[PDB]
Each structure stands twice: as C-alpha cells, then as structure tokens.
Design an enzyme around this catalytic site. Structure first.
Site, PDB file in Angstrom:
ATOM      1  N   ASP A 116      -0.051   5.204   0.904  1.00 40.69           N
ATOM      2  CA  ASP A 116      -0.261   6.452   2.248  1.00 40.69           C
ATOM      3  C   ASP A 116      -0.286   4.997   3.510  1.00 40.69           C
ATOM      4  O   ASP A 116      -1.311   4.598   3.623  1.00 40.69           O
ATOM      5  CB  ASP A 116      -1.643   6.926   1.998  1.00 40.69           C
ATOM      6  N   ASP A 132       0.601  -1.329  -0.282  1.00 31.61           N
ATOM      7  CA  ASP A 132       0.272  -0.120  -0.324  1.00 31.61           C
ATOM      8  C   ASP A 132       0.575   0.836  -0.432  1.00 31.61           C
ATOM      9  O   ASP A 132       1.585   0.765   0.176  1.00 31.61           O
ATOM     10  CB  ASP A 132      -0.762  -0.279   1.272  1.00 31.61           C
TER      11      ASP A 132
HETATM   12 MG   LIG Z   1      -2.576   3.248   3.672  1.00 33.25          MG
END
Ligand SMILES: [Mg+2]
Ligand SMILES: [Mg+2]
Ligand SMILES: [Zn+2]
EC number: 3.1.3.82
Length: 179
Positions: free
Chosen positions: A9, A7
């Site tokens: 962020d 992922d």
């Molecule tokens: Mg995230």
C-alpha cells in the site's frame, strides 16, 4: 541474485484511509507495475513485505486478500513483471506479533527464505515504519513520495542514508541507471 523488497500500500497500489478491502479497492499507482516489470526483466527477484491489519480487524478474509493479489499478479504478468513472493503481517497494532513493521520480522523471514545477507538490498516503503523495519534488518531503505511518503519525508527521523524518490517507477529507473 538481486533482491528487492517492496511495501505494498502506498508503493505498488494506492493507499486508502478506509483500508484496501477488495479487488476494486486495489488500484495500481501510475508506473508501479511497469517498474516491477523492468526489474523482473533485469533479473531482479521482487518480494513484497506488507502490513495487512485488515485481516485481524475482520474487514475482509483471506479469500478476498488472495483475490486482490490475483488481480495484481494478472496485471503484472501481462507486462512481463513478477512478484516472487508476498510476506505479510495479518496482525493489528497491539497484537504483539514479530512481523508488524516497524519490527523486522518479515525482513528476517525473507532473508531466511532466500538464504541471503540483506546488506545493500533495496527496501522501498512509503511509511517511516517501512524504513525502520528494513534498516533494522540490514537493508538499504528507499522512501517514495506516494502514499504516506510526503508526510514521512516531512517528519524526518529517517534511517541514515535513506534515498528519496517520487514513486516506485523512479526507484527502478535509479537502480537501473546505477546498475
Ligand atoms: Mg505502505
Ligand atoms: Mg511518476
Ligand atoms: Zn504480524
């Protein structure tokens, strides 16, 4: 090949309550770029799978998003790290797409891109939806404690066997220790 899915962020860069809407708002988390560099140098293919609802919400355009990733790419390059591809969902929460985590769409697209089975592929996230998307797709979920990770851990309901680390740097160290 040795694939790892990350992922963005809350794992690579700092999450923001206000969304990450420009290169200046994109700030690497301590150790995360170095972690990617370690994996790159150990012959891992590093791919991102990221929800980017800021596009659907009109907060920024694709030019700006590309500039954000250009910033990331340059910072990584100087350290000897490479993100091989970025899979991204540009949709909002109620937009009915296949790709918004917790749906597994992006993970399925990744499997197709590289023509691989996702069994045992580490997928690192900071949010419950990251772990669920990855697990549904067949990955081995890893949860970091940066970003939403402390909240995710505290709330439980994680996929069985989810591994927990303080940050992406700690994940890479664990993968390379256990190599
Ligand atoms: Mg995230
Ligand atoms: Mg650390
Ligand atoms: Zn989508």
């Amino acid at each position: 090949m040795k694939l790892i899915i990350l992922d963005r962020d809350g794992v690579v860069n700092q999450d923001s309550d206000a969304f990450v809407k420009s290169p200046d708002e994109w700030i690497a988390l301590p150790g995360s770029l170095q972690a990617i560099a370690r994996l790159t140098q150990a012959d891992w293919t590093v791919v991102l799978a990221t929800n980017q609802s800021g596009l659907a919400r009109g907060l920024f355009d694709t030019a700006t998003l590309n500039a954000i990733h250009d910033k990331m790419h340059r910072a990584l390059a100087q350290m000897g790290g490479v993100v091989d591809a970025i899979f991204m969902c540009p949709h909002g929460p109620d937009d009915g797409c296949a790709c918004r985590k917790p749906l597994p769409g992006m993970y399925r697209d990744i499997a197709r891109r590289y023509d691989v089975d996702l069994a045992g592929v580490p997928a690192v996230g900071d949010s419950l939806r990251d772990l669920q998307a990855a697990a549904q797709a067949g990955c081995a979920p890893w949860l970091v404690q940066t970003g939403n990770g402390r909240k995710t851990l505290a709330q439980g309901g994680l996929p069985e066997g989810t591994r927990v680390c303080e940050d992406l740097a700690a994940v890479a160290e664990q993968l390379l220790q256990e190599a």
